[PDB]
Design goal:
3 copies of one chain form a homotrimer.
Chain A lengths: L3 E6 L6 H9 L4 E4 H8 L5 H10 L12 H8 L3 H25 L4 E5 L14 E6 L2 H11 L4 H10 L3 H7 L2 E4 L8 H17 L8
Parallel strand pairs in A: 1-3, 1-4, 2-3, 4-5
Helix pairs in contact in A: 2-5, 6-7
Chain lengths: 208, 208, 208
Amino acid sequence: SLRYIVALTGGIGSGKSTVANAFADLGINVIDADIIARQVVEPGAPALHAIADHFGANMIAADGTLQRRALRERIFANPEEKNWLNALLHPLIQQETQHQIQQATSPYVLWVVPLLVENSLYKKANRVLVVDVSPETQLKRTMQRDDVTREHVEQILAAQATREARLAVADDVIDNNGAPDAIASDVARLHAHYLQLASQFVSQEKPE
Amino acid sequence: SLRYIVALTGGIGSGKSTVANAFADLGINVIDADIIARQVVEPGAPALHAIADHFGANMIAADGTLQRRALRERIFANPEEKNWLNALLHPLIQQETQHQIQQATSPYVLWVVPLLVENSLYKKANRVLVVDVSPETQLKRTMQRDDVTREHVEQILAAQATREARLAVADDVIDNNGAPDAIASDVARLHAHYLQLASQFVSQEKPE
Amino acid sequence: SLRYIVALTGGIGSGKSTVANAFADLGINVIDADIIARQVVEPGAPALHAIADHFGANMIAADGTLQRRALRERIFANPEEKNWLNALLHPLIQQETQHQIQQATSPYVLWVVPLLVENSLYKKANRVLVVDVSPETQLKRTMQRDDVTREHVEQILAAQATREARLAVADDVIDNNGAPDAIASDVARLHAHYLQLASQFVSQEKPE
């Protein structure tokens, strides 16, 4: 069957999880790109074995998890090694993603993709929702949540797509500058709208 | 000489050929990406020599043509090999497409590109026309024509950009849910506009 | 701190450097993607070492800098090396760009990017300014500048993003079909707006 896909994105500290949890509480199957990626390389995972074999024993930590910074260093300024890693991980991630879409029982799925803009993954969504906040909010929340410096987060902000680049691809925008309950009004309206879109989309003659 | 390029795209089953042929009917040269892709791997072409060298002489049929099914089967579990193939074919298809745009003597060309959204090729078009239909139509017409199962087309649709992603990059939309004849008037309207756009685009000082 | 990024782009013959110069005259740091590309292959830089590792020590000139002519020929001998080279430079160019934007002293920077649309690099700008001219201007200016044929320029134009593609991603558009001083008034109005956006973007709750 065809499933309706609403993709959710937002920059660091925008409160992506908060909004996705609000939809999850309404019975929507959330498909989380970062959760999937972490599971693909979890201890005893086949791909983690392949990583260790190709790159070295230095790739696996004491506790058995992937040493992400060491792997990063390994592919730095090396397109062939970066290509090798992607050729291993991308199809496993794609497969698990499609699998979860297919196994979803909710009327639409919420696909949470931090890199939606950067990887052009909006092309694979029926609807795009952006959780939006000020860069100030992104800095403060990140500084506080992960106990890190302002300059540290500022560097992360400089590496992700801009706030404007996300808004350029958005169908819907939810402001998340305040407390978690402040999103409830938008979430209720968007959910009711998405359920309607999902119920009509396969046979809908005229778009929008 | 600089030709005005209108790009036509649509999902599987959207009836791209029906619309392109209606533009041909009004005297427009149609350049078809799928046809160009076939032409660049014809017996004797460089791409074919290169493919046999990289993949083996078993990629070449008795009659010297490409064993497409075998090539697809070979690159299927290997993104690296799929990427190699695309990097080879990419500049050759671009070369041939330009050659055929240059040979065209109609007032503008219609460039039919199934993968327009997926490959970001709308960047190369002066104007984008999307042929739009319901997912049900894609399914029913592709089942009815190719005589395949519901669950065969569904897989195609999961591999393609969504309906909404295509509408997101369209300048013009033509609905093709119905019969081929309901298309005639819409195409005539668009052709008149494209004649005007084409007559003025080289010297037009201000954007429309 | 975090600096506001205005991207500038335009096709060949649009007079990008004339616009960039007008903003520099108003006190804005200009960050040029073609200059960055040279800086990332300077002695001591990772891209330089990776080029030498990949192609051989012959890629390094007597003075330790990149032997551009030798690299040019290796790409020509194997066209698919272009892809390796682009893949290497993409991340490194962005990192160097981020580093220079972080170091600028003007409230916003003007980031001049010829391939902004072709490479989707607008995803890394806060705002997009397109310098726009008719194809006729592009043709005549390139003919005069390089003493090349019309037919030679038309092939370049066929190779770059279209006029309409750039207009599709533009936040602001500036006409530069005429004399270099004719842009003065439009640049001043844009400059005043950009300083306001720069002063407000970090704490701005609501988008635009």
